[PDB]
Enzyme design. Structure first.
Site, PDB file in Angstrom:
ATOM      1  N   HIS A  49      65.906  14.166 -64.179  1.00  0.00           N
ATOM      2  CA  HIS A  49      66.890  14.709 -64.581  1.00  0.00           C
ATOM      3  C   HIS A  49      68.327  15.084 -63.898  1.00  0.00           C
ATOM      4  O   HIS A  49      69.353  14.765 -64.934  1.00  0.00           O
ATOM      5  CB  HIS A  49      66.515  15.879 -65.469  1.00  0.00           C
ATOM      6  CG  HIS A  49      66.642  16.783 -66.386  1.00  0.00           C
ATOM      7  ND1 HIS A  49      66.869  16.657 -67.481  1.00  0.00           N
ATOM      8  CD2 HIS A  49      67.744  17.724 -66.823  1.00  0.00           C
ATOM      9  CE1 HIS A  49      67.793  16.690 -68.683  1.00  0.00           C
ATOM     10  NE2 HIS A  49      68.132  18.402 -67.395  1.00  0.00           N
TER      11      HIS A  49
ATOM     12  N   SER B 155      75.997  -1.250 -69.509  1.00  0.00           N
ATOM     13  CA  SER B 155      75.954   0.244 -69.960  1.00  0.00           C
ATOM     14  C   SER B 155      76.581  -0.675 -71.694  1.00  0.00           C
ATOM     15  O   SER B 155      75.377  -1.684 -72.588  1.00  0.00           O
ATOM     16  CB  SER B 155      76.834   0.237 -69.694  1.00  0.00           C
ATOM     17  OG  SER B 155      76.500   2.001 -70.198  1.00  0.00           O
TER      18      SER B 155
ATOM     19  N   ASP C  57      68.054   8.066 -66.385  1.00  0.00           N
ATOM     20  CA  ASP C  57      68.960   7.828 -67.035  1.00  0.00           C
ATOM     21  C   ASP C  57      70.221   7.899 -68.074  1.00  0.00           C
ATOM     22  O   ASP C  57      69.106   7.544 -69.094  1.00  0.00           O
ATOM     23  CB  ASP C  57      69.102   6.494 -66.101  1.00  0.00           C
ATOM     24  CG  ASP C  57      70.858   5.609 -66.108  1.00  0.00           C
ATOM     25  OD1 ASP C  57      72.075   6.173 -66.302  1.00  0.00           O
ATOM     26  OD2 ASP C  57      71.247   5.211 -64.779  1.00  0.00           O
TER      27      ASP C  57
END
Length: 712
Positions: free
Chosen positions: A681, A561, A646
Site C-alpha cells: 500500500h 496507463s 499500484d
C-alpha cells in the site's frame, strides 16, 4: 495445448445509472441498465481475498514458466539502462549577481547539493566552491524530506532562504542557511520571493483543502505574527501566486483558475510598509492572462481575450492597464503561445507550432519600444526535437545571452547560451551518456499519417543509421495520448535497447494528446471524440507500413496507463497490424470502472472520458471499452505489467482483461501478466525497479521480433 490461466465465471450484475445512496452524477439514467460481468469477483478492495490470490498465483506461475528464455536478455538490458545514468553530475552554471550557481549530485548520496563559486572562478568541487545547502544534511535521520526552494537574497546573497517539508503534506517552513538570521516562517507553500536588499520576502499560505489563498510580506527580524497579508482569494476555483519583475522593482500578485486569471502589481520601491495593490484587469470568466514587466511603466500581457484561443501578446501602460488596444504579437491559428519572459532588451516567447515545442524572440526597435517586425523563431537542423528557454537560469535582467535547453531522439540534453542578436551558440553542459553511446549513429525524423477524416497526424521516429532502409525493419510504435499530454520527441535513453538492436523507434502523436495545440485534445480526442485516439494510432501504423518502414510481422506497440486504454482498444480493432504488444498498468475495464464512484479516481475522470451512468455516454464508451470488446479473433503476443497495490490502475482490470483474452482469442500466441504481489500500500516506486520492469518487457518485444543481438 499450453494455454494460460482462465478465471471461472461467477454471475454478477453491474448497474449503470441512478442508484439510491450513491453519487452517480448529476444526470444518471432512470431507470438504470444492467449487464452481467462474470469476472467481477476478481476485484477485492482489500487485495487479500484467497481465491483472488490463488488465481494471481496461477498467473505468476504461467508468467515465470514463459519468461525462462528471456531472463538473461532482460539482465543485459538492465545493465544497459544502468550504464546510462551519471551518479556524479554538475548542472549548467549560471550568473546570479557576483556568483556562478549550480547543483551537484554525488555517487553514494540520495540528495543534491546547491553550490556557488565567485564570479571569476571555475565551477566545481575545490577550494573555490561554497556549498550553499546540502540537502543530505537536512534529510539525515528523516523519513520524508523535500526542499521547495533555495532562495538567495539579491544584491549580496549573504542571507539564503530555503523551504523544507518533512511531513509530505506540501506545507513548508522557511528557514535560513545556517541560521544567519533567526527568523522562521511556518505554514507556506514552499515558494520564497525576495523583496529588495534582503529587507523582506513574500510567501503564500493555504486554507481549505490545501488551496493557496493568501499572499504575505515577512519583514526580516520581525515575528511572523506581525506579517502583513497583502491579498486573499477565497473563491475555491482560484489559487494564488506571487512573482517578482525582472528588474526587481515590481511584485506581481495573481489569482488563477483553469480558465480565468487576475493580476495585481505591488511597487517594491516604496518600502516595507507600502501594501496597496494595483489592479491590472478585473477577473472576467473565461479570460486568461499573464503579466510581465518591461521596466516599471509598461506591461506585456499574454492573453486569451477576444477569442484568441492560441494567445496574443499585448502591450499596455501601468497608468491605464485595462487598455489592451496595442497588439505586439497578433493571434495566429498556427502558433501556440504558452508564455513570455521579459528582459531589458528583448522578450522570449514559448509554445508550439506544427507539433513541436518552439521558442521565439522579440527585440527593441531603434527607439526603446518593443517591435513586431523583430519576431524570430529559433531554428534547428533536425526535423523533431525539443527546445526551451530556461529562465530559472536567467537571473540577470540586462543580458544578451539566452539560456536554452535542446534535446532530441538523437541528442542528449544540451544547455547553451545563445546570443539574442547574432544567434551564436556556446555549449554550457552537454549530458554524458555511457555504454558506448554516440550521437552520430542515429537519425531522427518526421512522418505524417492521414486519419480517416483527412487529419494529418505527426509521427516522430529514430533509428541507427546503419540499418537497411531499402527494406522494412522491426518497429516500435508508442502512444499515449489523453489529458492533452505531449509525448515529446526529446532524448530518452530508455529506447536505446530497441534502437541499438536494429529497431525503428516511433512515437504516434495522436489526438487526445496536446502536440498540435489547444484543440488536439479538447475537441480532438476527449468525451465523444475520444475514438480519434485509437483511429489516429492505427492510421500511424498503416502509414509506417504503406511507406515501407515496417510490415505487421515486424511491428510492435506499447502504451502505459491511459495509454493502456489506447493499446487495449487498438488490439480489438486492428490486431492484424502488430506482431507483439505491451500494456503497462492498462486502463481496460472502462465501463465497469467508470460507472462506479467507490473506485477512487472515477468521479474526477468523468471530466475526461465521460460518465457511463448517462445516456449521452453509455453506447459511445461501450464502443471502444477494451474488455467489453474482446472477441473471438487472432491477437498478437502481449505482455501486461501491473501491481496488486499500484494506484495507476486497479489490479483487477488487467487481470480481467488477460483472462478474457485467453478465453476467447483464436490464436496461439502468449499473453503474459506480470503482476507485482510484494509491493505494499505505502511502497515507494524506487527507479531501479522501473528499469527492471522496462527491461523484461523490452526483452519480450525483442525475442518476438527476433532482434536479440546488438548491431555494433
Amino acid at each position: 495445448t499450453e494455454r494460460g490461466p482462465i478465471a471461472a465465471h461467477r454471475p454478477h450484475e453491474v448497474v449503470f445509472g441512478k442508484v439510491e445512496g450513491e453519487d452517480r452524477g448529476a444526470n444518471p439514467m432512470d431507470p438504470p441498465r444492467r449487464r452481467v460481468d462474470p469476472l467481477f469477483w476478481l476485484r477485492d478492495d482489500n487485495r487479500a481475498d484467497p481465491e483472488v490470490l490463488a488465481h494471481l498465483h496461477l498467473e505468476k506461475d504461467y508468467y515465470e514458466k514463459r519468461a525462462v528464455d528471456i531472463k538473461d536478455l532482460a539482465e543485459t538490458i538492465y545493465q544497459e539502462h544502468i550504464s546510462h545514468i551519471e551518479e556524479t553530475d554538475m548542472s549548467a552554471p549560471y550568473v546570479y549577481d557576483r556568483f556562478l550557481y549550480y547543483t551537484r549530485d554525488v555517487k553514494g548520496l540520495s540528495y543534491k547539493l546547491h553550490c556557488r563559486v565567485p564570479a571569476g572562478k571555475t565551477p566545481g568541487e575545490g577550494e573555490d566552491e561554497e556549498i550553499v545547502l546540502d540537502e543530505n544534511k537536512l534529510a539525515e535521520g528523516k523519513s520524508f524530506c523535500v526542499v521547495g526552494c533555495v532562495a538567495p537574497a539579491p544584491p549580496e546573497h549573504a542571507l539564503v532562504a530555503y523551504s523544507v517539508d518533512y511531513c509530505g503534506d506540501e506545507v513548508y517552513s522557511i528557514r535560513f542557511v545556517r541560521d544567519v538570521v533567526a527568523d522562521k516562517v511556518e505554514g507556506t507553500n514552499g515558494s520564497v520571493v525576495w523583496g529588495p536588499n534582503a529587507e523582506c520576502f513574500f510567501y503564500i499560505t493555504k486554507d481549505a483543502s490545501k488551496r493557496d489563498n493568501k499572499v504575505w510580506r515577512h519583514i526580516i527580524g520581525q515575528p511572523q505574527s506581525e506579517d502583513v497579508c497583502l491579498y486573499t482569494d477565497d473563491d475555491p476555483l482560484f489559487s494564488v501566486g506571487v512573482g517578482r519583475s525582472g528588474d526587481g522593482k515590481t511584485l506581481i500578485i495573481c489569482s488563477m483558475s483553469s480558465e480565468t486569471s487576475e493580476s495585481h502589481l505591488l511597487d517594491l520601491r516604496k518600502g516595507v510598509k507600502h501594501n496597496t495593490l494595483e489592479m491590472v484587469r478585473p477577473r472576467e470568466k473565461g479570460v486568461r492572462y499573464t503579466v510581465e514587466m518591461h521596466g516599471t511603466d509598461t506591461l506585456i500581457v499574454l492573453t486569451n481575450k477576444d477569442k484568441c484561443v492560441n494567445g496574443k501578446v499585448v502591450l499596455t501602460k501601468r497608468s491605464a492597464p485595462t487598455d489592451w488596444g496595442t497588439v505586439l504579437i497578433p493571434h495566429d491559428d498556427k502558433v501556440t503561445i504558452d508564455d513570455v519572459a521579459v528582459f531589458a532588451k528583448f522578450a522570449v516567447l514559448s509554445g508550439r507550432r506544427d507539433g513541436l515545442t518552439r521558442v521565439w524572440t522579440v527585440r527593441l526597435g531603434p527607439d526603446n519600444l518593443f517591435s513586431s517586425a523583430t519576431l524570430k523563431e529559433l531554428h534547428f537542423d533536425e526535423p523533431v526535437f525539443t527546445a526551451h528557454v530556461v529562465c530559472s537560469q536567467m537571473k540577470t535582467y540586462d543580458a544578451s545571452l539566452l539560456r536554452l535547453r535542446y534535446s532530441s531522439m538523437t541528442t542528449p540534453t544540451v544547455w547553451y547560451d545563445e546570443d539574442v542578436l547574432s544567434g551564436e551558440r556556446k555549449v554550457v553542459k552537454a549530458r554524458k551518456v555511457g555504454g558506448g553511446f554516440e550521437s552520430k549513429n542515429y537519425v531522427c525524423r518526421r512522418e505524417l499519417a492521414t486519419a480517416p477524416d483527412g487529419t494529418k497526424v505527426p509521427i516522430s521516429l529514430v533509428y541507427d543509421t546503419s540499418i537497411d532502409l531499402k527494406k522494412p525493419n522491426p518497429t516500435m510504435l508508442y502512444g499515449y495520448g489523453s489529458y492533452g499530454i505531449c509525448i515529446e520527441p526529446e532524448f530518452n535513453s530508455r529506447f536505446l535497447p530497441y534502437v541499438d538492436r536494429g529497431m525503428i523507434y516511433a512515437i504516434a502523436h495522436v489526438r487526445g494528446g496536446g502536440e498540435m495545440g489547444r484543440t488536439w485534445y479538447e475537441v480532438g480526442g476527449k468525451y465523444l471524440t475520444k475514438r480519434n485516439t485509437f483511429m489516429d494510432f492505427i492510421a500511424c501504423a498503416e502509414h509506417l507500413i504503406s511507406s515501407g518502414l515496417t510490415t505487421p510481422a515486424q511491428l510492435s506497440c506499447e502504451g502505459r496507463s491511459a495509454g493502456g486504454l489506447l493499446v487495449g482498444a487498438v488490439l480489438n480493432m486492428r490486431p492484424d497490424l502488430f506482431h507483439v504488444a505491451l500494456a503497462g498498468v492498462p486502463f481496460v475495464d472502462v465501463m465497469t470502472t467508470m460507472c462506479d464512484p467507490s473506485i477512487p479516481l472515477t468521479t474526477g475522470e468523468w471530466e475526461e472520458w465521460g460518465n457511463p451512468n448517462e445516456y449521452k455516454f453509455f453506447d459511445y464508451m461501450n464502443s471502444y471499452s477494451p474488455i467489453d470488446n474482446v472477441r473471438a479473433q487472432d491477437y498478437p503476443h502481449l505482455m501486461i505489467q501491473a501491481g496488486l497495490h499500484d494506484p495507476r490502475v486497479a489490479y483487477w482490470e488487467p487481470a480481467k482483461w488477460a483472462s478474457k483474452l485467453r478465453e476467447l482469442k483464436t490464436d496461439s500466441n502468449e499473453v503474459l501478466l506480470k503482476m507485482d504481489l510484494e509491493s505494499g500500500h505505502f511502497s515507494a516506486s524506487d527507479r531501479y525497479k522501473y528499469l527492471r520492469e522496462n527491461a523484461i518487457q523490452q526483452a519480450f518485444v525483442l525475442k518476438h521480433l527476433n532482434v536479440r543481438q546488438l548491431l555494433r
